Ligand SMILES: *[C@H]1CC[C@](C)(CC)CC1
């Protein structure tokens with residue numbers, strides 16, 4: 001009956017309009033602490049995040065799910081500060097992404113389960129802030145360690161009811177192996193969002209996942225390097241498909257009967273140290289609306305394409321609440 | 328005229344008997360903060376380190392150089408606590424080892440130089456504690472990023488006078504490429520210790536480095552899996568050469584005229600999360616003396632083999648002071 005946020009438990013009705021895959025800062029463990037000048041300063045990063053979340057709140061957003069893990073450099077004290085100043089709920093994540101250090105990569109499935117359970121059930125570091133989601137990742141066929149991470153995420157979710165959300169290389173159909181591993185541990189697909197699924201146009205892949213009961217994360221809608229001229233690093237990161245092409249996948253899944261299984265987000269950030277220098281400036285030039293892009297641009301676009309206000313409210317309010325509520 | 332420690336500047340004469348390659352904890356960035364239970368508890372790790380350093384101090388040690396970097400999970404607040412409780416000076420390190428995260432691996436040589444200079448000239452995180460050595464690493468041919476790290480370490484040392492110490496795969500003669508890169512930046516070999524050099528018996532490699540002026544780090548003397556039965560992970564980490572075989576390299580370099588260029592250490596730790604679970608228990612069974620192994624076992628061994636007290640005092644007191652004193 002309660003979702004954990006960086007400011008404590010909230011009721012399901014308090015979540016409201018929820019972006020289910022976002023980041024305050026995409027970094028690495030300990031990096032903001034050791035090298036804040038990379039972001040100008042910690043205070044500058046806080047100010048940029050607060051301004052952005054305030055603009056998102058003005059556009060209707062009430063909650064974001066920050067799916068930054070330990071190895072994305074999640075700083076829940078930073079999240080708590082930004083959430084208080086902007087009056088936007090923030091759900092924090094446990095799990096591991098694609099850059100775990102040796103001290104994680106050498107661990108067993110049982111050890112990883114203990115760590116994920118620590119952050120869900122006890123707290124993150126010494127903050128008492130508890131994670132409300134488990135984030136995992138593959139980029140193609142799972143490494144042996146990533147198989148353990150997926151299994152540990154399933155075990156932590158089975159013990160707590162907290163959902164799992166994934167990073168995929170969608171064009172490699174990673175979600176199929178992720179699903180197989182999750183189901184081998186007994187995890188219900190209704191507890192799992194297969195993310196970055198808007199990175200592919202393969203409807204046979206997307207509907208294969210949705211038919212089994214998975215939630216489908218169409219979470220990078222504004223990610224596009226169309227127009228960026230001669231920027232190889234931005235094109236490799238953002239792709240050459242338009243935001244409209246990504247957004248139309250929302251309509252496609254609605255038209256196939258999966259409106260209750262769609263989760264939509266921007267996968268935006270306010271600082272970004274785990275990629276090339278100045279990528280944040282490039283991304284901000286692509287999408288000045290930042291996290292407000294979903295309510296300000298995507299929802300009107302889909303309404304114009306014939307999607308009802310009621311269905312879009314179900315996707316942005318009802319589905320995230322059903323997903324995040326521990327079950 | 329001063330060496331920076333985790334408790335502030337000390338005079339050269341205060342350093343005394345110095346172990347030049349040690350670790351309080353071999354971990355990963357943020358790991359002790361996020362998962363202290365891996366070590367039992369933070370307090371248990373502190374207590375184990377204080378007991379060990381007190382036993383080292385009783386055996387004659389006055390200073391250790393903790394060559395844990397950012398990506399070894401260096402916690403200078405932990406080092407400061409242990410150094411105060413044990414009355415042993417601890418010199419902290421900057422640099423990067425073999426497990427840098429994406430936020431480091433994507434950086435330029437200029438950016439890395441800024442980061443190393445930050446930790447030497449300003450402070451580590453928000454602690455005001457300044458590093459007194461720069462640690463770098465290769466395992467075979469340098470990766471492109473490791474080339475940048477070596478160059479940035481050279482630049483930081485050229486600006487500050489602080490020395491550089493390296494991790495090598497000694498049997499692959501890494502020190503030769505490390506030397507080439509350092510010298511291409513104008514760094515004096517007298518500011519560089521090529522470490523893990525006791526991992527090889529190749530005198531042609533060791534003397535090639537010493538002839539150019541490098542300091543030679545014979546820093547893992549008690550590392551041996553001889554006697555360990557059927558432990559593949561311990562054998563891969565520690566090797567099958569005896570501690571006596573490693574220690575006799577000290578005598579070999581003395582006999583070749585390099586007594587002033589030898590640095591000796593244990594490469595010991597009190598916690599170790601970046602390898603297999605329970606490796607610390609295995610290592611402690613191999614060498615119950617821990618960091619006291621050099622004064623309690625190696626120095627008497629070399630005296631029995633004909634090395635003078637005066638030469639061993641030069642190696643353990645004079646050489647570390649000459650190396651660490653900024654120049
Ligand atoms: C909201 C109304 C229901 C549809 C039209 C699907 C029938 C989607 C938009």
Ligand SMILES: *[C@H]1CC[C@](C)(CC)CC1
Pocket residue numbers: 581633634635636637638639
């Ligand atoms: C101390 C005295 C000098 C030697 C014998 C090298 C001549 C080493 C031991």
Ligand SMILES: [Zn+2]
Pocket residue numbers: 167168196
């Ligand atoms: Zn991702």
Ligand SMILES: [Zn+2]
Pocket residue numbers: 021022023067267
């Ligand atoms: Zn993301």
Ligand SMILES: [Zn+2]
Pocket residue numbers: 494495523
């Ligand atoms: Zn090493």
Ligand SMILES: [Zn+2]
Pocket residue numbers: 348349350394594
């Ligand atoms: Zn070491």
